[PDB]
């Protein structure tokens, strides 16, 4: 004695019932050990990938989109670069973390940004790397950036610098379509001895921290 109830005989595409094996007696090929098993996408989000910071129409078809120019022949009052911290938008959107977050509606947790200087061992320079919180508005000068959260990075002493931007929003998650700005400024002119390139390149990278989380999966035409 049974009653079927209003869900009976549906194909709900998200259901999780048992179903008959088409091939009993068949034993699948034994699962051997293969290196590099992935159990969660958050393992992939934790890898540092290059930010295409140098988005200009001459560079976007090439390796040059990843490298920021540092040079002697410059207006030292201008920003070196700026990165909006939202993984929803350029330049972060095509990084591995921006790509994995594009499969989800909601994201949360801390982002690690890393910067690598690629000038000679004889090249020296100070850069000021500043984080500006959401809603504060991007700094207009090196002095304004220095009054905020910042690192004065001597690239002569340290070839790499890092910044961890913690989660800061009213809700425990935010949609994947502000988080603030990272901005870079000259603290000094570019210093070199003779017979040394008077310019260099810097590479910017992003990854998730161990607290990172994605929620509410979605599929959309962000790839055709």
């Amino acid at each position: 004695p049974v009653m079927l109830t209003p869900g009976s005989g549906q194909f709900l595409t998200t259901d999780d019932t048992q179903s008959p094996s088409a091939f009993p007696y068949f034993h699948p090929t034994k699962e051997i050990f293969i290196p590099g098993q992935v159990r969660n996408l958050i393992e992939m989000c934790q890898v540092d990938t290059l930010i295409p910071v140098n988005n200009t129409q001459e560079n976007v078809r090439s390796v040059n989109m990843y490298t920021v120019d540092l040079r002697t022949q410059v207006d030292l009052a201008k920003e070196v670069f700026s990165i909006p911290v939202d993984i929803a938008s350029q330049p972060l959107a095509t990084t591995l973390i921006g790509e994995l977050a594009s499969y989800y509606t909601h994201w949360t947790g801390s982002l690690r940004f890393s910067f690598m200087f690629c000038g000679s061992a004889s090249s020296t320079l100070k850069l000021l790397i500043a984080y500006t919180p959401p809603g504060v508005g991007k700094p207009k000068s090196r002095r304004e950036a220095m009054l905020g959260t910042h690192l004065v990075w001597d690239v002569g002493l340290q070839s790499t610098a890092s910044l961890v931007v913690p989660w800061v929003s009213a809700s425990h998650f935010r949609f994947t379509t502000s988080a603030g700005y990272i901005t870079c400024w000259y603290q000094t002119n570019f210093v070199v001895p003779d017979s040394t390139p008077d310019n260099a390149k810097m590479v910017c990278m992003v990854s998730a921290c161990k607290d990172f989380c994605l929620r509410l999966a979605r599929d959309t035409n962000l790839h055709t």
Binding site: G36, V63, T94, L96, C118, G119, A121, S123, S159
Partner: protein, 230 residues
């Protein structure tokens, strides 16, 4: 310091700072072996890195098919298996600058340089010890698309190290055997591709050496073969 394998010896102080791909050390196949006569370092001809260079790649085991005992074992057995130590060295002055990514890609199935459903030809995917230096069945030249339609900024998801000429002149990758079968045809299929791409191009002032050598040394590790023939 000095590293010795078989009758081969190479010099580098960086050897303890190797990246082990996926955290898995190479090993012999479990119950569910020629040793050091096979497992030498084979040092390839050095690449000339210049400001114009787009990068280089090699396929494994293909780059070793002509290399001594290991190369003979690839023809004299039906199936084979190995890991690798790849050591990449890049000697330069304090006045040179540049950034390489050195990456190992499992199953690096190349795209063609053409618009059709046409496959990349066997002659192009098996370049041997010379590799391909990047410039209708030929592979892609787009190192910025990883030759496979994926962005170069995302290449660090693979086992990799950087060579930043101010910091380090070398990289070491330790690669386990990676395949969906215990052993495979060493001549029809490549488990790994070594990819070396300049992220920041070489710069040096005139009167400095305009080409810097990239030297690649590859040792088989835990190599195993089956179906021996004379």
């Amino acid at each position: 310091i000095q590293i010795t394998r078989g009758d081969s010896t190479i010099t580098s102080q960086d050897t303890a700072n190797a990246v082990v791909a996926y955290g898995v050390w190479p090993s012999y196949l479990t119950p569910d072996q020629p040793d050091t006569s096979s497992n030498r370092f084979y040092t390839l001809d050095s690449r000339s890195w210049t400001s114009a260079s787009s990068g280089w790649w090699w396929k494994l085991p293909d780059a070793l098919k002509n290399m001594g005992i290991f190369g003979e074992n690839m023809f004299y057995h039906f199936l084979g298996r190995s890991g690798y130590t790849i050591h990449v060295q890049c000697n330069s002055s304090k006045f040179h600058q540049g950034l390489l990514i050195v990456a190992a890609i499992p199953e690096h199935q190349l795209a063609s340089a053409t618009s059709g459903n046409v496959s990349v030809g066997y002659n192009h995917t098996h370049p041997g010890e010379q590799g391909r230096e990047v410039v209708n069945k030929r592979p892609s030249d787009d190192s910025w698309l990883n030759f496979d339609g994926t962005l170069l900024g995302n290449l660090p998801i693979y086992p990799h190290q950087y060579i930043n000429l101010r910091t380090n002149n070398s990289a070491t990758l330790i690669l386990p055997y990676v395949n969906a079968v215990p052993m495979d045809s060493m001549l029809r299929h490549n488990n790994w591709s070594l990819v070396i791409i300049p992220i920041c191009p070489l710069q040096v002032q005139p009167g400095g050496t305009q080409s810097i050598p990239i030297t690649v040394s590859i040792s088989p590790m835990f190599s195993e073969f089956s179906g021996p023939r004379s």
